[PDB]
Amino acid sequence: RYVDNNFCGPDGYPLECIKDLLARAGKASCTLSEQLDFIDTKRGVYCCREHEHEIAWYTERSEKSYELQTPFEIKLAKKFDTFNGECPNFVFPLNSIIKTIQPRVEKKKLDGFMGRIRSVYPVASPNECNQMCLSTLMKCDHCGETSWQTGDFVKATCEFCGTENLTKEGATTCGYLPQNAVVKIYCPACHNSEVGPEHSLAEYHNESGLKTILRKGGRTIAFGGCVFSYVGCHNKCAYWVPRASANIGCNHTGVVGEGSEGLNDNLLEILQKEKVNINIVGDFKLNEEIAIILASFSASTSAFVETVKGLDYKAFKQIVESCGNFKVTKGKAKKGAWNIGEQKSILSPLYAFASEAARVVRSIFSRTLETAQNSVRVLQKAAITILDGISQYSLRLIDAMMFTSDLATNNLVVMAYITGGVVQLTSQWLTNIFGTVYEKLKPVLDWLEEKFKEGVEFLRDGWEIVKFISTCACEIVGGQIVTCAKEIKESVQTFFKLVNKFLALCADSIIIGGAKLKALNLGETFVTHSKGLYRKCVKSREETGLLMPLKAPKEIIFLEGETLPTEVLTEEVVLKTGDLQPLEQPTSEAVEAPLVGTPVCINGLMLLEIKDTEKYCALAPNMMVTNNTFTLKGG
Ligand SMILES: [Zn+2]
Ligand SMILES: [Zn+2]
Ligand SMILES: [Zn+2]
Numbered sequence: 001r002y003v004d005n006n007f008c009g010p011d012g013y014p015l016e017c018i019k020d021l022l023a024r025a026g027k028a029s030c031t032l033s034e035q036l037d038f039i040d041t042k043r044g045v046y047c048c049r050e051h052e053h054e055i056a057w058y059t060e061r062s063e064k065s066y067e068l069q070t071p072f073e074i075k076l077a078k079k080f081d082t083f084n085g086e087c088p089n090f091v092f093p094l095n096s097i098i099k100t101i102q103p104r105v106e107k108k109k110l111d112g113f114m115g116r117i118r119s120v121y122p123v124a125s126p127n128e129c130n131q132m133c134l135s136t137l138m139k140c141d142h143c144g145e146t147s148w149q150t151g152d153f154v155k156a157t158c159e160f161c162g163t164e165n166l167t168k169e170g171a172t173t174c175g176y177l178p179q180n181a182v183v184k185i186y187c188p189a190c191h192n193s194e195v196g197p198e199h200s201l202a203e204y205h206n207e208s209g210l211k212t213i214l215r216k217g218g219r220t221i222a223f224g225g226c227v228f229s230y231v232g233c234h235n236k237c238a239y240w241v242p243r244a245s246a247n248i249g250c251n252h253t254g255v256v257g258e259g260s261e262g263l264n265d266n267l268l269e270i271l272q273k274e275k276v277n278i279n280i281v282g283d284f285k286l287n288e289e290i291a292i293i294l295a296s297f298s299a300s301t302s303a304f305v306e307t308v309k310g311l312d313y314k315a316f317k318q319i320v321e322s323c324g325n326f327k328v329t330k331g332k333a334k335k336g337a338w339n340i341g342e343q344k345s346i347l348s349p350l351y352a353f354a355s356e357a358a359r360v361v362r363s364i365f366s367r368t369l370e371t372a373q374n375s376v377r378v379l380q381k382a383a384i385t386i387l388d389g390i391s392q393y394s395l396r397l398i399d400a401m402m403f404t405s406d407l408a409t410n411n412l413v414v415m416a417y418i419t420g421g422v423v424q425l426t427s428q429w430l431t432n433i434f435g436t437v438y439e440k441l442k443p444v445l446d447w448l449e450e451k452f453k454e455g456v457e458f459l460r461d462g463w464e465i466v467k468f469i470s471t472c473a474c475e476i477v478g479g480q481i482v483t484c485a486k487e488i489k490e491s492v493q494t495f496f497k498l499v500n501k502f503l504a505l506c507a508d509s510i511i512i513g514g515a516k517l518k519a520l521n522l523g524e525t526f527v528t529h530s531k532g533l534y535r536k537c538v539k540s541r542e543e544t545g546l547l548m549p550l551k552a553p554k555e556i557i558f559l560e561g562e563t564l565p566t567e568v569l570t571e572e573v574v575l576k577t578g579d580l581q582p583l584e585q586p587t588s589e590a591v592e593a594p595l596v597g598t599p600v601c602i603n604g605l606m607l608l609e610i611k612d613t614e615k616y617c618a619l620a621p622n623m624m625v626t627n628n629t630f631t632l633k634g635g
Contacts, residue, residue, distance in 0.1 A: 002088045004057035005080060006032065007039060011222065012071030012091045013215065017048050019067055028067055035066045055080045056088055070217060071227045072244050074098045087261045093225050093254030094264055095272070096246035113232040113239075120241050121180040126234050129182040132242065133175030133354035134224055135347075137259070138168045148173075148347040150362070152183055153223040154210050159347055159366035162386065171260050174224035174245065174253040175352025176296070183228060183240040185210075190236035197236065204230070204238065225253035250276050250325055255349050267349055270338050278320065280330040281341030284313040285408045286401055288346045288365045294319060295361045296353035301393045304357035308397070311405040343410070363390040364398065367413040369456075376452035376462065380420030383413045403470050412459060419462035422469075423448045429469050433476050434533060438522040443502050461491035468492045478529040479507035479520055512536075512618070513557065513605030515580040515630065530586035530627040534561035537621045544621075546599065546606075549575045553604045563624035564588055566595045568608065573599040580605065583615070583629040590615055590629060599623075602632070 003009055007018050018039065022028050027035045045053050060076035061069060077092040092098055103119040110118060113126075123129060135148040140158040142165070149156035155166050189199040189207035205212065205219060212219040221228040226242035233239065248254040248264065249271030255263040270276070278293070286308070294311070297319055298304035307319070317328040333339040346362060353362075367386050369379055387394040395417070401407040402418055409415065423445055430441050437445070451458045473484045480500045488496070508521035512528075520527040527533055537558040541548050544556055552575045564587070580602055588595070592615060597608040599619065607616035608625050614635055618628040 001051055001053055002056040003053045004059040004077075005055050006036065006059055006061050006069065007044075007053060007066070008059070008061075008069055010057075010088055010090045011213070012069075012074060012227075014066050014069050015053075017051060021047055022066055028065065030065065032061065032063045032066055032069070054083070056083050056085075057090055057094075070215075071220075071222070072100055074244075077246070089257055089260075091222050091227070091256065092246045093248060093256055093260060095268055096225070096248045096254050096264075098244060098246055100244045101241065113234045116232045117182075117234075117239060120231055121182075123180055126182075126239070129180040129239075130178035130354055132178065132181050132183050132226075133352045133359070134183065135173055135175070135349070135352060136167050136224075137171040137173075137257075138165065140165055148349070148352075150347075150359070152185055153221050153228070154185065159363060160368050162363075162367060162389065169258070171255055171257040171263060172224040173255040173260075173263075173349040173352060174226045174242070175349075175354050177242065177245055177247070177251040177253060178354045181242055181245075181354075182231075183242075185238040185240060187233050187236055187238040190233060197233065199233075201230070204233070208238070222256075225256045248272055252349070252352070263349060269336055270350070276326045277334065277337040278326050278328045279334050279337040279339050280313065280328070281333045281339050284316070284330065284406075285341075286311055286405050287340075287343060287408045288361070288411075289340045289344070289351065290316065291361045291365070291401070292346060292351045292353055292358050293340075295357035296355045297323065298355055298357035301357045301360050301391055301397065304360070305393050305397045305400050309400045309404045311401075360391045360394060360397065364394055364414060365409055365411045367411070369412045369416060371412065371456045374455050376416065376420050376455060376458060379412075379416040379455060379459075383416035383420075386413050387417060402466070406471075407467075412456065415459040415463050418466055419459050420452075422462045422466045423452075425466055425469055429472075429474070433474065433481070434522060434527075435525065440506050440522050441502065444499050447498055461494070464489050464491045465495045468495075475531055476503075476520070476527050476533065477531050478518055478527060479504045512559070512628070513580045513607075513630070514603040515582055517582055528628060529582070529584070530629070532562045532587075532627050534559045534626070534628075536560075539621065544606075545571070546573045546601075547571050548573050548601065551575060552601050555604065556601065556606060557604045558606055558621040559618045559626045559628060560621055561626060563620045563622065563626055564595070566608065566625040568623055569596050569598055569611070571599075573601055573606070574609065576600050576602050578602055578632040578634070580607075580616070580630045581633055583631060586629050587627040588617070588625075588629075595625075 009015050022035055025038060027038050039047050058078050058080045059074050062073040064073055071091050075098050078095050079087055101120055106119060134152050135150045136156050137148050139146045142163040143161050149158045149165060151157055153167060155164050157164050189195045189204050190197045192207055195203055195207060212221055226245040228240040229243040231239045231241050246253045248268055252267060252271050254267060294316055295304050298307055320326050321328055347366060369382055398414060398417060426445055426448060427437055430437050474481050481496060503520060506520045506522055507518055510517050510519045510526055517528050525533055525535055537560040538555050541552060541554055541556060592610050592613045594611040597610040600607055600609045606619040607630060608619055609616055616630045618626045620626050
């Protein structure tokens, strides 16, 4: 029977043996300090004959007489200075400051629910209240793992499998106390057809059937470092509020229960500061820890979907710091800082954010798949089913994270959802490059379909492929696709090698203006080393509008494709002969920058004769300069 320095028990209430000693001594009407002086005079710890009430905790309590002490009169709790041993279970965490909600006095007459909730919080409606994040560290009977399951003080959902379990003895915690913190509990009384809404308080407790703590002062619940009381019901749900809650920094309530001592030490090192130091270690990435912290600042899931669109370090810094409770840094890991970069489990008292978006984020990145050598498409269908169950915005949220920013995760449900789309993305990617999907290119999509048969084994490779392609800067140069000068992972190198092999097999020989070029032949289109897709456009002399000599070929060859914003000095076109030689400097990569010249028709091909040099560039049907650079052997 451990007590605090005020001889009160671990539940925050007085003991019967001490009330009896004070009663027989005539000290019941005395103040707390006067009563303590008496109790200590009578040997304190040994004031009882059959008990040794070792002092385990130090608390700061109001002067109210010992008999009137409750958890609601505590302001500070810590381990007693001279207590050498492990902390027993205590209603509040150690080294915490306890806050209470002082009910407001209303001036106007209100209905039962709105009157009571508006005394607790200054809200216009229950829609302005925030459901608290309550979690319990307990075994999931459906699976066998032990983790922090999220729910309320009656039941919780296991994030790995999505099933519900009843709360059991273990470490409990409430997350960061939100504004207008409430807990919504299913109210059988309102669903019981024999009771219905507008039930009495006694009926509520009898129908609820949960194990409250019964005291002369009412029925309360102690969970996760908070003491909850019942306020009222609305929409057939019961509302509990944290009449009293601990604060260990950043408005976190800490951990109580078995094992809470070590957990609280880990929280205090990080949160027990005037300002919480959030330190991004290495490159900024939208991992689970960043997503959950940012989600904590969203009003709704859909607001978060928009918020993450194009998320970068700066936007994250500004949004998080705007509340004034955090300071965001980046660089090397620091001792005592909230170091983000190494991946850690998101199911802990830390990251226990109560926002709507945060709950969606936590669910999305915590679910597992029942993987049994299933194909990617089967896994995707399962992943989508899971994601839809979490939230109707869950797919759009992931889409935004993966395609507008830089998303990272090892969650198989998210990976399966995205990976199954690599075929559709690849089809669009090939369409963007070549204009469509050709039979010569389909083998690229057949390869992905074959890899889908590997199931989980291909999720990481597909992830990297989707990530790269989603934000790639690819261009086709002759028979090879090249990328920007970035490091390419082995899984992405493999994807591009097989794509380029299928393309090298199509590297045919074409003639443009008499010149031999190595170019892809995918059907009606071709690609040259000029870094673009072109078609052969043939028009009659009279159809071009050129001031062509009558000795020119009847048919004039143009290259239809991407062009440069160049200008033509004159409509006059020179009729000239020569041996056109392609250059390795396409797309105006030559030293010459006039971007103007005189048209010339060489072997039926229209080129612009670049001013003040001897280089030529092919013209498109619209008389704009293309990326195909030529010269003439001998001038
Ligand atoms: Zn005793
Ligand atoms: Zn489970
Ligand atoms: Zn009710």
